[PDB]
Amino acid sequence: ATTLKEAADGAGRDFGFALDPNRLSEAQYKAIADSEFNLVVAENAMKWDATEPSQNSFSFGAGDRVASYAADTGKELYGHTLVWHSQLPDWAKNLNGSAFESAMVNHVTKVADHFEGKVASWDVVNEAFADGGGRRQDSAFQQKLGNGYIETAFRAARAADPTAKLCINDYNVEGINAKSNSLYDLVKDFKARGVPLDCVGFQSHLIVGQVPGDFRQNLQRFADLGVDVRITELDIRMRTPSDATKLATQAADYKKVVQACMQVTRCQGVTVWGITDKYSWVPDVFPGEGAALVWDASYAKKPAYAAVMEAF
Ligand SMILES: O[C@@H]1[C@@H](O)[C@H](O[C@@H]2Cn3ccnc3[C@H](O)[C@H]2O)OC[C@H]1O
Numbered sequence: 001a002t003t004l005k006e007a008a009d010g011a012g013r014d015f016g017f018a019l020d021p022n023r024l025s026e027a028q029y030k031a032i033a034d035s036e037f038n039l040v041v042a043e044n045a046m047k048w049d050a051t052e053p054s055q056n057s058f059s060f061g062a063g064d065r066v067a068s069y070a071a072d073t074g075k076e077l078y079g080h081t082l083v084w085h086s087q088l089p090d091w092a093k094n095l096n097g098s099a100f101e102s103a104m105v106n107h108v109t110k111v112a113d114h115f116e117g118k119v120a121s122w123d124v125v126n127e128a129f130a131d132g133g134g135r136r137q138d139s140a141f142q143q144k145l146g147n148g149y150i151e152t153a154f155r156a157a158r159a160a161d162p163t164a165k166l167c168i169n170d171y172n173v174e175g176i177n178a179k180s181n182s183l184y185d186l187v188k189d190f191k192a193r194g195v196p197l198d199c200v201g202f203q204s205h206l207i208v209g210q211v212p213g214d215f216r217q218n219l220q221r222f223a224d225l226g227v228d229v230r231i232t233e234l235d236i237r238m239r240t241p242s243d244a245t246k247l248a249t250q251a252a253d254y255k256k257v258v259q260a261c262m263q264v265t266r267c268q269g270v271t272v273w274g275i276t277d278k279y280s281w282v283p284d285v286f287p288g289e290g291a292a293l294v295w296d297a298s299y300a301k302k303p304a305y306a307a308v309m310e311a312f
Contacts (some may be wrong), residue, residue, distance in 0.1 A: 004036045004294075004309060004312070005035060007309045008312050009038055014230075014268050014269030015037055015271070016039025016040055017040060017041075017274065018041050018271070018274050019041065020045075020279065021042075028299050033069075033073075033275060037075065038075055039078060039271060040066065040070045041080050041232070042079075043273070043281075045062035045063045046063045046066065046111070046115075048082075048087060049088065049089050056106060058111075077115075077118055077120055078119070079111075079119035079122040079123065079164075080123045080169075081123035081124075082107065082123070082153065083104060083107075083108065083149070083153045084123075084127060085126075085138065085139035085140055085142075088140055093140050095144075096144055101144075109156055112156075112157050112160035112161045116160070116161045116164070119161075119164060120165060122167060123169040124154050124157045124166045124168065125149075125154070126168075127171065128142070128150055128183075128186075129183050130179065131172050133182045135182075150186065154166055154190070154197055155195065155196060165199050166198050166199070169202075169232055170183055170202070171202075174218065175215060176217065176218045184221065187200060187227060188225050197227060198227055198228060199230060200230075201232035202231055203233040203273075204231045205273070206253060208236050208250045209253065211253045215257065219263075219267055220263075223267070227266070228266045228267075228268050230261075230269060231270040231271060234270055235272060235293055236253045237282050238290070238292065239288055239289060240289065240290040242291040242296075246291075247303050248303060250303070250304050251302070253304075254307045255307040257270065258270055262311060262312065272294060275293065275294070275295055276293060277290060277291050277292065277295065
């Protein structure tokens with residue numbers, strides 16, 4: 001109505017953001033975080049590198065801060081992420097066979113247990129597949145453990161947390177293609193055999209002017225397998241600097257994404273990967289690309305803001 005939180009709340013869906021706990025000391029950042037979202041996810045604080053820097057030695061300070069923030073502001077807490085090929089410490093990469101599998105399972109158990117009852121959902125496994133279909137080719141988990149690591153990770157997560165929503169997350173799976181198809185088969189297989197799995201996340205790290213037209217259809221087929229779906233890391237990057245046309249297209253793109261979710265009853269909601277363009281991860285990875293978020297570098301609402309409110 002007046003804020004995006006109000007729009008999402010009124011719609012009965014979630015609208016979250018990727019939080020960097022250190023930014024909470026920046027008043028403006030905190031103000032927008034407090035009033036514009038009803039869900040929070042750690043942008044980096046709950047990743048392996050941030051939680052288990054050395055074998056069986058945990059660092060929960062940053063993760064705890066994110067969790068405390070959600071509880072203090074009354075927002076849903078989304079966990080990210082227990083098993084991922086990236087931001088994996090070297091000590092883990094140096095392990096093999098049973099040693100590596102145990103380190104993985106111990107990591108999953110310790111983190112899930114630590115945040116049990118606080119984190120409502122977990123990206124148990126992140127980016128297990130590859131563009132073009134099949135499994136990811138540069139993953140330590142796939143290379144050292146094979147196809148069964150995903151099931152192992154999920155069963156371990158349920159073992160630790162009996163009620164948390166266990167999700168599998170990925171990108172380039174927004175549309176119906178080889179990658180999402182392989183992801184589709186896995187989800188169907190898991191539900192078929194009783195492997196703990198409750199949700200599927202579609203990152204949605206999109207490019208301005210390029211939103212899958214079959215996004216809704218894709219979300220629906222997964223929802224129909226008996227699992228919830230969610231846009232987890234939404235941001236739509238453009239060639240910087242921005243201009244009127246790019247901002248208008250971006251706004252329209254944000255609208256399409258949110259509408260596709262609104263059109264699927266089991267789509268829990270949408271989470272944007274950050275608040276302001278001044279801290280977005282995009283520029284540092286894509287030279288000359290950026291302005292992908294809802295707020296600009298001066299915290300002024302971009303036209304994408306109105307588009308999101310409308311879609312909800
Ligand atoms: O600070 C950045 C984070 O923003 C970044 O988050 C990543 C973004 N991303 C793109 C594709 N897949 C993903 C991951 O799910 C998500 O964790 O990670 C790197 C940090 O330097």
